[model samples]
Target chain A: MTIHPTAIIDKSAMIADSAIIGPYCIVGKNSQIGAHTVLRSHVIIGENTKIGVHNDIYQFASIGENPQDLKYAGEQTYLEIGDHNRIREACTIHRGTVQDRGITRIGNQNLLMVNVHIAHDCVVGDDNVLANNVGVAGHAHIGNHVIIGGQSGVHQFCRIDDYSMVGGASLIVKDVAAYVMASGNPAKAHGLNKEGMRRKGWSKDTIKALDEAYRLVFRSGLLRDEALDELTKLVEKEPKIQLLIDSINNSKRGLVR
Target chain B: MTIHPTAIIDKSAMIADSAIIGPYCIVGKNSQIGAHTVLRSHVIIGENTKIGVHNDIYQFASIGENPQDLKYAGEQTYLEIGDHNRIREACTIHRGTVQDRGITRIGNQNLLMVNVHIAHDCVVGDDNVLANNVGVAGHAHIGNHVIIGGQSGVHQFCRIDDYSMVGGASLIVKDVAAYVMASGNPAKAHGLNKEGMRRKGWSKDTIKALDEAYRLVFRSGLLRDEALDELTKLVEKEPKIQLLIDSINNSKRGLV
Candidate 1:
């Protein structure tokens, strides 16, 4: 391992030979770092955490810290991070609580920008983008391919499903359906995430089906039960509609209007 | 006195014998830290700043940094902080600019929560509570005993008078009067801060006078000039009314 002279690593920590530990870093005991992972300056990795390969953690980023939840009493909680994540400056990813899942998990290829705070037990899926100063509260579930804009706050227990884009400076107090674009306080779903679909190169028929599903849920003025009933009719032809239907049905805090 | 071996302290920096500097901290030249002040790990103290005694500075706080203003040209400015303040983790307090007063000043007994940003040339008074993620823009004047809630952003050049309370996630674009509770974007006055007055042990007559003044200004629907005229009439009988009248008259961006 290419370890800087100033880095303080515990005797019990396990690091790959190819890993790079930079200046002023503190790696606690029982932490395992995979191959080719780079810890930049002033990073802190707490105990019992496992970091996957090729992750670049920038300056002052704190991983596997004790949960901010008041109920936490120093139980042996954990943080599991997958490969190739870009965690920027001053971002804090807290460990989970024994009261909940006992593990805060993050999937592969995520980009967490500066000053982002992922609270206890947040399950972040692969390929998600969290912009600067985004604060996700405890137990928030973020699905794959999600983009949370800068300075936005996701309330505790909120769910942001796949392919959803939450705009900057928003307050998300509810679940955001799949393929949705939401903004503002108590976020309102503006329309379908058309640009995201185009970027993903989804087929025209798939995009059309999602657009029609969005209209039934938001623009039709029908009750939620009626909209779900109408959406069920489209699921046979467009399987992607099930993602949206399942997200809406499973949301305990309700979906953004 | 208790300086960690890994701390990088400049030779010209003046730290007291009773002070404690934790691991990996950087103390720049020309900075002065008073006795009993504790700097937790990874704190950065920039040059030309003076911090007083008994302050607990949490990890990763950057104090006395250069101003964020585009007009700044690397001039020698200052930051002056008084005693017994709790500056939480990741908070940033920038120094003053040559264009303004050349000193960003903070008074004693304040509690600044996590990620709070105090821009250049801001003057914060004593016994204030600035909650988490509160951003005070440059040149703002925060009066004594003000409680600004979490995630609130105060605009530059605005003033928050004494005994006022601002709610969470508010965007304060205008000045806030004393003893008022203001909230929301382009924040509007909700009512008098009755809870604060009771906590301060304010007399019933004093609370009554401020309540009457709040009615004249907001509830009575009078014009600004009419409210000022009515407030001026009460100033002779109650000296505290003068603080309200003076704040309203001195407001440059208008009151909320």
Candidate 2:
């Protein structure tokens, strides 16, 4: 391991030999750093945390710390992260609370930018980009390929679906369905993320099917079950539409109008 | 000084004998930690910063760090803090930029809550309570005894006057006058902070004078100079009104 002399790693911390721990870094007990992981100066990881390969956490970032939830009575929880994540400056990512899943999870290739706070019990999926100063509150579930813009605040228990893009400084209070584009104080669903799909080089048939599903669900003024029924037929045309349908069905907080 | 074994202080740094530097703390060169200042573990103070007496800086906080300004060219700048401040966890306080005052000045008795970002050249006066996740951008000036609510972002060069209160999740783009209550996207003045003044035990006459001045300035439908003239007479009734009058006169980005 390329551990700096100033780094204070507890004896119980399991560090891969290929990992780099920079100056003033602190890895607490029962923590694990995987292959080629890097902690820049002033990075602190709390107990029961696990970081996988090729992650670069920058200075002043604290991860896997105690839960900020009031119901949290210091129960031994965990924070688990996978490969290729970039956690930037002053970002605060907390461990889970026992009242929830007892683990805050982040999947592969996520970019949590400067000062971003991921509260306890958040399940952030792959390829997500949470921009600078974005605060996703407790128990939020962010699906894959989501991009939240800077300074936005996601309310507690709001689920952001896959391939969605939320605009900067927006306050998201409700659930955002898959492929949706949302922004504003209450974060209304403005449109489908056609530009995002196009940028990702998704097939035109798949993109068009989601667009058709969005119109049928939101614009048709049909009942939610009716919309879900309509999306099932759309799922026959494009399989990705089922992901959208399943997420909408999973939403405890109702989807944005 | 009760400096921890692992604490690192530079040769030019000065720590008062009563101060406590906790574990994993780092103090850079030419810095001064005054009497009874307490830095909990993982606190980092950058070069040329001066922390005064009885300031308790919590863990993961970084003070006098480099300015986050685009125009900052790494010029020699400073962060000067006065006495009795409670700087909470993960707060990022930047030093000054040469373009502005060449120093970030924080006066006595301020409570900067967790993750508050005090950008370059910001002047925060005495007894201010900046709540959690508040971001006061570059060159902003905050007067005495103000309370900015949680997650509010005060835009660059905006001035928040004395005794003003802003609500949570607000975006302050304009100047906020004294005794005003502001909130929301652009942070308009909803009303005077009469409740705040009453809680502070301000005199009835002084509070009423501010209320009258508020009415004349914002509600009278009069021009700016006309409102100033009305406030001049109100200042005679209560001298604290003069501070309000001066704040209004000094509005650069225009008051909220």
Candidate 3:
């Protein structure tokens, strides 16, 4: 371990031999750091946090702090971060609350930019990009391959499904279905994330079907249940289409319009 | 007197006997910390700043930092923080600039929440509650008892008048009138803060007069000058109405 002398790690903390703990870092008890994970300057990891391998956490980023929820009363909650995540400067990942599942979790290969806040009980999926100053409120569920833009605020309990893109400075108060592009205050769905689909090597037929579904679900005059029925009919063969339908169906808070 | 052994305080810095300086805090030269004030940990107080008594500044809060303004260039400026302020974790309050009064000031009993940024030359009045991640841009004026919600950004040089409440995630691009509740991206006035008026012990007559004025100023089909003329007539008896009129008249960026 390339641990700096200025690092103050708790005796009970389990750190991998390949990990690097930089200057002014304070790792609390019951925390386990995986192999090759690097904590840069001034990091404070609270108790019961587990950070996985090859993650690079930058300066002043606070991990596993107590939840911001007013009802939280010092219960022993957890934060579990998976491998290869880059948590940048001044980012805060708050621990979970007893009211929820008591575990805030982040999957692999996520890029959390400067000043991003992942509140309590937030479950972020793999390969997500949360841009600078984005605030994901408590209990938010962020799906795989999502891209949230700078300065966006995701309201508490909102879910953003896979391959969705949220534009800069948006205020997301509702759920966002899969492959949707959302923007503006109380964000409205613009269209499908065609560029994302293209980059993911989605076939031409899949893109065309999604385009039609997007129009039917968002632009057509039909009510939500009717549009969802139409989408069910369209989603007969395509796996992406089935994913979209599942996302919309599973949404507790209605999708952004 | 209770300075931590690891704290780096310059010889030129003046700390009161009852003050407590925690570990890793750097107090620069010419900074003065008052009685019973506490710097929790890792706080960077820049030069020429004055913090008054009983203030609890949490971890990593940077006070008197150089202005984010591009024009600022090593000029000596000041930050004056008054008594009983709770400046929360990672909040940044920058010093003043040469172009302005050269002093950023915060009055007593203010609760500045986590990650709140008060930019250069800003004047914050007493009993203000600025919630988490609220960014007040340079030269803004925040009047007494103003409550700004979380994740809001006040544009540069904007004035938030006394007893005003700004809702969460708002982008305030203009001045806010007194006792108004503004919310949205480019914030629109929702209505008068009647709850605030009631809490402040405002009489029914005063509230009624303010309500009528709100309609004339914001809802009336008349122009701003015409509305002001109508409000001028309403202000004849009530001094609170005069205060409202004066706030409107003094606003440089116009009201929200």
Candidate 4:
């Protein structure tokens, strides 16, 4: 597509031939953009950033701005994105700091709602939805297919596992386990994400095994190792259950007890 | 300062020689930016607005955007800003309505903190500090040197008098009188803002007199007219008391 006459595309900035740059848009010095990416009016992509293809970035979205972190001291950092993401208006995604090795990495197909802040060095996986006013602090790792609710803030260095759903306006201060529905101020695992699992087309047998596994960990008061062993046997039967068991066993800062 | 090579400045927009437009900034068609004003990277200033001199407008501010009010039906409206205001990141200031003569007026030296919103047709006076996330609704008249604490939301058409300080996260549904300290979910007048008045360089005698004037209106159980007579006599003797007298006299919706 054609670049607008008013768009200031620096010849040095490596924009793909198929990309569309609308009026009043600026692709910064040495910034690399992928093919078929549509940047609408009033967009500012900063330097040393690499963005992937087919991203429909809306108006007034400021990507790869400098981090708001006080420790960030003008070091050269990068913001790396995988393909096909939709970043909305007024969202501030900062470049990573040297403390986290200076790269903010995001995976594909994520819907970042308006005013969402992805601070320095956040590793966001594919197919996640960060709703409006969700602020993820520095160095947070969000796993795939997760839905972080509106007005919620995930504290720095916290890890939320795959397929978990956090409720609206919740302050997530601790680590969340996979396949769980967590909610409240200091968010607790209320229950298994049964509705979400069902919508994902997990079988009744798989759901029953997860229920049994949850009962062992939460209801029976077993040791965490004992729970892992018990969950492992069930995982041998259902591979989806193994995904949960392995995620539970492999947590570095262990999930909410 | 030089305009950044990547910045897109509209042909019809008149920018001052000292104004600085950073990389990738978009000054929309017909948005007049005054002298020494700084538009940082990625900021969007919309159409038909008057932003005054020496303002430090930070990144990604959406000023003079269309009003969020549903009654705004494609009519011509405006945002009028005065000198030396510091508007931080992501603050949304909407334009005025034709109903309010189409002007949202912000006076000089106001520091609108991060993510604060000024809705349509609001009039903000000089030296006001609207803290982070202070939401002023449509047609709100904020007098000079008012301190709206963080996360507070002022209701529509409510008036806040000068030198008054509302605490954090207050829901102001009624008018706040001058030189008072008010806070709560549904805010009430707790006491006089003697500390603020003193810090703002009001004399000890002025504080004592305004305190007595406050007690006459709130504690003495006198009617509004009786309190006005007392206040008029006090202000006739001391000019400092006129702010309170005038605020009370001109209040259409009653004070808190």
Candidate 5:
């Protein structure tokens, strides 16, 4: 509820009265800090960024910085964060590029640990945990309940769907489908995230169906079209299979397997 | 030649007149920044650190922060850096622990690229280039003229000797001997650094001897003592082989 006198806020910025702006923080012009948000010492919020309520941004994190893309010209770009996110030390989140949506968007309840870098035009969904030194490149889209491990690198334009887990020190260059667990350099799908789904209270019958679908689509040597024809029947029986089908259908880059 | 008004310098800290302390910097007590040094904006120099002349520390680098080691208590420690080093953006270097020498030491003309982490009690020598996001774990010793590539990690208590080159995204779990080129997870020795030594203007005869010594010591079917016995004759002929010999002898965690 208090703004420290040592903070440097631009005149055009909008800060809610309940927000706590700590010492040595620099809030740029055209930015907004929502209610009960806390910017700890030395955090810099660049222009055109909007941070939502109850967020805690730690020291030395540069939010909404200019894109690292070479082709990013002087265009008006933005970064929008939803509520209850914790951005830890030395994390860098960049604004979007004009070539893409011109906005980098992050949904609620994400924990970005130390030194994580989220590049331009990335769309990160809710309840994601990005571990230390994880680098999500430009135009990458990460869906809900994703866990990316430490020191992993996701290539540009890659799509990571929901409830997926990535291992530490991996290099992901392809699109990861829902409920998949990927690890290693040029990451290979280890299997379905059977453990994660079980812990999240998913039923045994649904898990069995997803496992059968994973085997039919990935393990079977059938053509991609042939696998989809088989999976379409399961989607009718269990609507949860539709999430996996849509992920495979929407993939621009090929699957991790 | 410039000290910004926003800088917070402690009473015991000594900054040279030619040094540039940029905006929003904090220099803690008992720290000394030498002549012609520049700390760019938002840098934090913690207490008990000593930095030498002509160094350029970029923004958001935390020099002499507390070590990430779990065993480290709150005892006093130090970080010491020599001249002409360029520490880039978001790099984090930590001080040492009482379990070791109580100091993390870095020598001259090193370039630590962006987001590099030098953990507690590391002794990094002169003319090294640690590329982006390289992590050197606690108590690791890096010798002179080393080139560790981008996104690589050095395991704790390992030693990387002089004139070595490590490939990008490698995981170093063992000691790397001098003049060796190592790469990959649990990094393997590729070969002698022939190109690196040749570029350094080493003599052809010396390079050939080192190569023969490398093959005998590493690739020979003979036992290690037998290989060293054979290498002793060549070491007498070419003294440069001693660097390699000492590295092998001093290896505590074994060779890469």
Candidate 6:
């Protein structure tokens, strides 16, 4: 590893030999940075954390810090950030607290925009675009390919399903359904995530299937059992319909729609 | 004054004798931090700026960067932060541009909350609490004790009045009247700032009289000439009423 002349790396830090540490950065003792990991300037990596390979962390981004929770009394915790994540400027990812289990896990290729805050013990999936000031409250499970908009605040323990798009300044107080666009202060089901689906090359047949799924749960005015039965029948013939049907079936807190 | 054992102090920087620089900070060249200043860890103060005395700058804050304006092109401008101000974390204060007369001035005793961005050439008066993620666009003038809420975005050249409280997430596009509570995306005047007046110990009689004055312009739906006449009559009797009346009278982009 090439440490910059001005960079400060604690002697006990377990950095892989292929890592590159830039100037004005601080890596604390007991932290492990994986091979080919590049930490740009002004980044602070706290103690007892683990970061995986090919992560391009930008300037002024503080990761693996102590949890911001008041109940954390200097206990040792872990922040395990996975591979190829591009963390932008001034984003804060807190370490886990013992009360909520001692690990916060982030999967790969997530684009965390400026001023994003990932609180303690949150499990984030892959390819998510959490825009500026998107406050993912503690212990929330964010699914893959979910695009959360700017200034949105997600309540604690809420689960967002895959391929969902949340609008700007949204306050998500409940679980969000898959393959749709939801927005509001208290977020509601607005429409399908059609534009996003088209850009991602979802076939027209798939879009039609999901549209039927939206109507079954939303427009039918039917109860959960009736909606599930109707959705299940549609899913048997269409694969995309199966995707929405399975997510609805697996929801713990009922879907926000 | 102690530089932390790990802090990076560049050779060309000018540091004052009484300044206390904390751990993991990077002070670039030609930057001058004034006397009795305490910079906490992880602060990046860019070059050629002057930070004044008794300032408590918090962690992970980026200051004195070039403006985000596309017009800026490597010109030498200044970011002049004044004395006794408390700047919180993740706040970005950009220096001025040639277009905006080349200086961004922050007066003393302002409480800038987390993630507030004071864009290029903005003039901020003292005793203001600019809450988190509040974006004051270039050349905006903020008056004293103006409590701007979180996630509010002010358009360029807008003037926020003194003693005004703007609610969260307001998209301020015009001038806000003093002693008013303005909210919404394109903000409309909700009502008088009675709660703030009460906190400042404004008497019942004084508030009652101000309510009468406010009604002439906003509630009574009087014509401009008739409202001006009503305001002028009230201003002569009460000096406190005069501030509001003159603020209303002189407003070019009339009260929002």
Model-by-model DockQ, in order: 0.22, 0.19, 0.37, 0.10, 0.17, 0.16
Clashing residue pairs, backbone N/CA/C < 3 A, model 2: none
Query: For candidate 2, lDDT tens digit of each residue in A1-257?
Result: 49999788899999999999999788888999999998989888889999999999999888887775546777899999999999999888889999886999999999999988888899999999999988887899999999999988887899998999999988887899888899986568898999988987999888877888889988899988988987887787688888888777889999987
Which residue pairs clash within candidate 5?
A: none
* Complex DockQ, candidate 4: 0.10
Question: For candidate 3, lDDT tens digit of each residue in A1-257?
Answer: 49998788889999999999999887887999999999988888888999999999998888987776657888999999999999999898889999898999999999999989898999999999999989888999999999999988898899999999999988898999988999988688888899997887988998998888889888898887898898887877665677777777888988898
User: How do all the candidates rank in terms of TM-score, highest first?
Assistant: 3, 1, 2, 5, 6, 4
Q: Whose TM-score is greatest here?
A: 3
Q: Over the full model, what C-alpha lDDT does candidate 6 score relative to the true structure?
A: 0.82
lDDT (Cα, tens digit) per residue for candidate 6, span B1-256: 3679777888888888889888877887678899998987788887667899999887777788888889899898888888988886788898899887898988888887667899999999888888656889998888788898767788887888778888766789987766778876678887787888797887888888877877777788787677877776677666677666556665666567
Colliding residue pairs in candidate 4: none
lDDT of 1 by residue, B176-249 (tens): 98888997665778898898889778899988888998899889888789899887668877889877887888
lDDT of 6 by residue, A67-88 (tens): 6453678888999999999999
Which window of 10 residues has the lowest lDDT sum in candidate 6 chain A? A65-74
Q: Give per-candidate clash totals.
A: 0, 0, 0, 0, 0, 0
Query: Lowest-scoring 10 consecutive residues by lDDT in candidate 3 chain B?
Result: B232-241
Itemize residue pairs with steric clashes in candidate 3: none
Every candidate's CA RMSD: 4.7, 5.8, 3.6, 8.1, 6.2, 6.4
Q: Which pairs clash in model 6?
A: none
lDDT of each: 0.89, 0.88, 0.89, 0.82, 0.89, 0.82
- TM-score of each model, in listed order: 0.79, 0.71, 0.85, 0.62, 0.68, 0.67
In candidate 4, stretches whose alpha carbon ends up further than 4 angstroms from where it belongs are A184-188, A219-257, B4-18, B22-37, B41-60, B64-89, B94-115, B119-256
Q: Which of 2 and 4 is ahead in lDDT?
A: 2
- Give the C-alpha miss distance for residue B31 in model 2, angstroms: 4.3
TM-score preference between candidates 2 and 6, better one: 2
